[PDB]
Amino acid sequence: GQPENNYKTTPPVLDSDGSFFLYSKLTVDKSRWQQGNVFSCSVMHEALHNHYTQKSLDKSTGKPTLYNVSLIMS
Amino acid sequence: GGPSVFLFPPKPKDTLMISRTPEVTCVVVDVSHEDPEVKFNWYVDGVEVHNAKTKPREEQYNSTYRVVSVLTVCHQDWLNGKEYKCKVSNKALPAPIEKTISKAKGQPREPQVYTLPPSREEMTKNQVSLTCLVKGFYPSDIAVEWESNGQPENNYKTTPPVLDSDGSFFLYSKLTVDKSRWQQGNVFSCSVMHEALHNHYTQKSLDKSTGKPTLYNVSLI
Amino acid sequence: GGPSVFLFPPKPKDTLMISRTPEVTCVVVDVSHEDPEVKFNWYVDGVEVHNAKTKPREEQYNSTYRVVSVLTVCHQDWLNGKEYKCKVSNKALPAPIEKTISKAKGQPREPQVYTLPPSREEMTKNQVSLTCLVKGFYPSDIAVEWESNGQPENNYKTTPPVLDSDGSFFLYSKLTVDKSRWQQGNVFSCSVMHEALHNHYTQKSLDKSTGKPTLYNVSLI
Amino acid sequence: GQPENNYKTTPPVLDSDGSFFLYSKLTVDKSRWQQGNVFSCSVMHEALHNHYTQKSLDKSTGKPTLYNVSLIMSD
Numbered sequence: 269g270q271p272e273n274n275y276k277t278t279p280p281v282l283d284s285d286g287s288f289f290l291y292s293k294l295t296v297d298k299s300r301w302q303q304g305n306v307f308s309c310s311v312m313h314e315a316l317h318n319h320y321t322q323k324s325l326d327k328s329t330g331k332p333t334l335y336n337v338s339l340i341m342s
Numbered sequence: 343g344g345p346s347v348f349l350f351p352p353k354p355k356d357t358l359m360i361s362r363t364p365e366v367t368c369v370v371v372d373v374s375h376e377d378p379e380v381k382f383n384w385y386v387d388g389v390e391v392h393n394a395k396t397k398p399r400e401e402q403y404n405s406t407y408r409v410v411s412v413l414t415v416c417h418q419d420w421l422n423g424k425e426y427k428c429k430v431s432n433k434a435l436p437a438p439i440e441k442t443i444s445k446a447k448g449q450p451r452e453p454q455v456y457t458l459p460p461s462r463e464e465m466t467k468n469q470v471s472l473t474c475l476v477k478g479f480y481p482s483d484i485a486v487e488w489e490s491n492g493q494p495e496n497n498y499k500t501t502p503p504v505l506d507s508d509g510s511f512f513l514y515s516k517l518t519v520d521k522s523r524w525q526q527g528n529v530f531s532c533s534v535m536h537e538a539l540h541n542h543y544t545q546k547s548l549d550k551s552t553g554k555p556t557l558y559n560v561s562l563i
Numbered sequence: 564g565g566p567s568v569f570l571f572p573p574k575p576k577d578t579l580m581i582s583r584t585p586e587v588t589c590v591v592v593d594v595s596h597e598d599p600e601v602k603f604n605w606y607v608d609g610v611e612v613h614n615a616k617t618k619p620r621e622e623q624y625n626s627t628y629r630v631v632s633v634l635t636v637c638h639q640d641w642l643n644g645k646e647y648k649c650k651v652s653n654k655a656l657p658a659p660i661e662k663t664i665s666k667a668k669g670q671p672r673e674p675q676v677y678t679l680p681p682s683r684e685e686m687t688k689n690q691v692s693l694t695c696l697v698k699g700f701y702p703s704d705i706a707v708e709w710e711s712n713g714q715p716e717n718n719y720k721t722t723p724p725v726l727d728s729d730g731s732f733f734l735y736s737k738l739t740v741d742k743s744r745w746q747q748g749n750v751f752s753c754s755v756m757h758e759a760l761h762n763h764y765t766q767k768s769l770d771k772s773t774g775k776p777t778l779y780n781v782s783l784i
Numbered sequence: 785g786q787p788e789n790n791y792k793t794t795p796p797v798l799d800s801d802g803s804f805f806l807y808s809k810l811t812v813d814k815s816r817w818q819q820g821n822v823f824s825c826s827v828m829h830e831a832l833h834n835h836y837t838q839k840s841l842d843k844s845t846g847k848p849t850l851y852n853v854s855l856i857m858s859d
Contacts, residue, residue: 269540310541317492318535319360320543332556332859334782339559341775342846456685458694461677462774473679473735475692497728501735504722514735518728529784551780554683558782558855562748562772563844582835713833754834762826764836774842779855 272307343374343405345432347441354483357420358535358542364420366413368428368441373399373407380409381431381438387424421537423447445483450538451510453479457532457548460524470524472548474532477512485535486515489545490528524550566594566601568651570662575704578641579756579763585641587634589649589662594620594628602652605634608645641666642758669701671759672731678753678769681745691745695753695767698733702758707736710752710766711744745771785821788812817843 274295280288292309307325348369357364370380378399384390395412411428425444432439456475464470476484482503488495497518503511515532533545553559571588578585591601605615617632636647644666652659679694697707703724709717716738724734736753748771756764792809799805808825820843827837844850 317489318543320541322541328556332783335555335557338557339561340848341560342563342844342848342850456682456692458679458682458685461679462776463677465776467675471677471696471698473694473696475694499725499727501722501725504720507718512737514722516733527781527784547784549781549784551782552682553780553782554687556782558780559683560775560780563775563842563846708834710833715833754836762828762836764834766834766836766838768838768840777844777851777853781858783859 343434344372345370345374345380345430345435345439346372347428347430347439349441349443351443351445351483352420354537355485355535357417358485358537360417364415364417366415366426366443368411368413368426368430368443370409370430371406373409373432374434375405377433378407380407382409382411383427383429383431384411384413385427385429386413386415387419388427421447445481447481449480451478451480452538452540453477453484453534453536453544455532455534455544455546457546457552459548459552460550465521468521470519470521472517472519472530474515474517475512476515476534477506478510479512479536479538480510481537482511483537484513486513487533487535488515488517488530489533490530495530565656566651566653567592568649568660568662570647570649570664572664573636573641576706576756578704579706579758581638581763584638585636587636587647587649589632589634589651591630591651591653592627594630594653595655596628598654599628601630603632604648604650604652605632606648606650607636607640609648644668667702667704672699672701673759674698674700674705674755674757676753676755676765676767678767678773680769680773686742686745689742690739691742693738693740693745693751693769694735695769696733696735697755697757698727699731700757700759701730701732703732704758705734706756707734708754708756709736709738710754711740712749748772 272294276293278290278293280290282288294307294309304327308322311321312319313321348371350367350369352364352366356362370382373380382394382396384394391413393414395410397408397410399407399409409430413426415426423444423446425442428441428443430439430441453476458473458475460470460472474486474488476486484503486498486500488498495517499516501514501516503513506512517530519528519530527549529547529549531545531547533543535542535544569590569592571590573585573587577583589603589605594601599620603615603617605612612634615632615634617630620628620630623629630651632649634647636645646663646665648661648663650659650661674697676695676697679696681691681693685691695707697705707721718738720737722735724732726732738751740751751769753767753769754764755767788810790811792811794806796804796806810823812821822840824838824840827839828835829837
């Protein structure tokens with residue numbers, strides 16, 4: 269929930285369909301990855317509902333594998 | 343005939359929504375027949391601003407006229423909590439009547455929103471009830487919506503806020519859905535908008551037997 | 564204009580309780596100081612009854628005399644729907660004021676009581692919320708209580724019910740417990756008391772392992 | 785769903801500690817029991833709170849394997 273000072277935004281690139289895209293890059297120290305701090309990219313636009321769209325980053329950001337332990341049915 | 347004045351608080355969703363224009367309405371009832379016209383005066387921040395929305399008078403069997411004065415204020419002005427002043431003068435009334443509206447901004451607490459899995463017995467009934475709990479808010483002005491698949495739900499019930507031991511009110515949102523819709527795995531989102539909320543939006547997704555860990559858990563039976 | 568006489572309806576808990584007989588109370592407010600004693604008359608279906616009583620006058624903060632009179636009505640009589648009349652006579656009052664009340668009339672339909680187990684994250688917070696809802700009752704005379712292994716502890720939230728689309732009223736009840744209490748798996752009883760229920764009292768039991776359907780529960784959308 | 789016509793109850797039997805105990809019996813059809821019908825034995829006593837206690841009985845016996853149907857994984 270706090271702004272990040274060390275972040276960069278790429279200029280938009282024109283597409284064949286006429287839309288635009290860009291990448292927002294955030295750099296952090298290596299030691300910060302162990303704590304698993306939550307990160308998000310916030311974009312302001314009129315098309316999005318209520319001008320809000322947030323995506324959270326966690327450790328299980330890739331393919332998730334279920335935990336080894338399984339609860340007994342009965 | 344004993345004119346009366348009533349205070350109507352403004353809807354928080356008008357101020358919270360950027361597109362929606364906030365409006366503050368002061369209403370006067372029991373206007374006597376001999377003086378249908380009511381002298382209305384409006385003040386915002388102690389100053390005069392040139393805007394007015396006076397509803398036309400209507401005839402009633404009780405010889406009572408309802409006059410509503412609507413004022414337009416900005417989001418920042420509404421968030422300030424400054425008093426809005428409505429003065430009403432009538433020939434029958436010996437002295438003018440004064441009313442003011444100003445919501446109290448005290449201890450802004452960020453609301454907490456939770457969703458619960460549907461009850462087991464609910465599968466037997468052909469209607470399934472979905473519950474959305476919200477608490478942790480001091481003021482009574484809360485915006486709630488049911489935004490399923492990006493479109494608002496036709497039917498939703500909101501319980502009035504009630505007192506609590508923690509000092510922050512809590513309430514519920516109830517939705518009724520068909521069993522066929524829930525069987526296929528439909529996802530419904532409970533959106534909460536508050537004046538003290540961050541970015542004025544909180545929502546989450548739910549499904550059948552919601553589980554925070556990525557694991558298949560089953561309790562005793 | 565002098566004393567005002569009202570007949571407060573009996574509390575819903577006493578009306579439907581077999582052990583606690585319902586009590587009908589009649590209140591006189593703004594009683595003149597020069598005439599503290601007021602003549603009381605209680606009529607049951609036009610019949611005088613000798614079981615009526617009145618409490619001694621109690622001083623109010625506003626220095627206004629307040630008088631209360633209580634009558635013990637039969638528990639079966641309230642089920643039948645008898646008529647009770649309170650009449651108060653005062654020398655200062657020019658004309659006595661009589662208040663008439665009657666039992667609510669409607670089709671008796673059995674309400675449905677459901678229990679919502681907490682989600683997979685509700686125990687992450689310090690307080691775990693247990694919810695029991697009751698739907699489908701036309702009369703407003705209903706009681707909801709919480710029981711925990713024979714130890715009476717009720718939050719008396721008594722959230723006001725709101726009408727549904729079909730007109731069937733519904734209400735919710737919430738209780739707060741600790742992590743250890745929820746993890747223990749002790750039985751928690753939501754007790755509902757209404758006219759339509761069998762024997763006028765029923766209970767619903769909720770445990771940590773409240774129930775798991777035989778069908779597989781998906782952990783992801 | 786419907787009150788049961790059948791109802792059997794033995795007279796109370798004195799216990800060693802001085803208390804009492806008894807049983808209540810309900811005979812029904814196999815199909816009704818297999819269909820997961822809701823059954824309970826309401827108990828009313830002077831010492832009991834609210835003078836009403838309900839103990840509903842569920843169809844499941846709590847066996848470790850009762851589903852006997854292969855599960856489906858969806859991510």
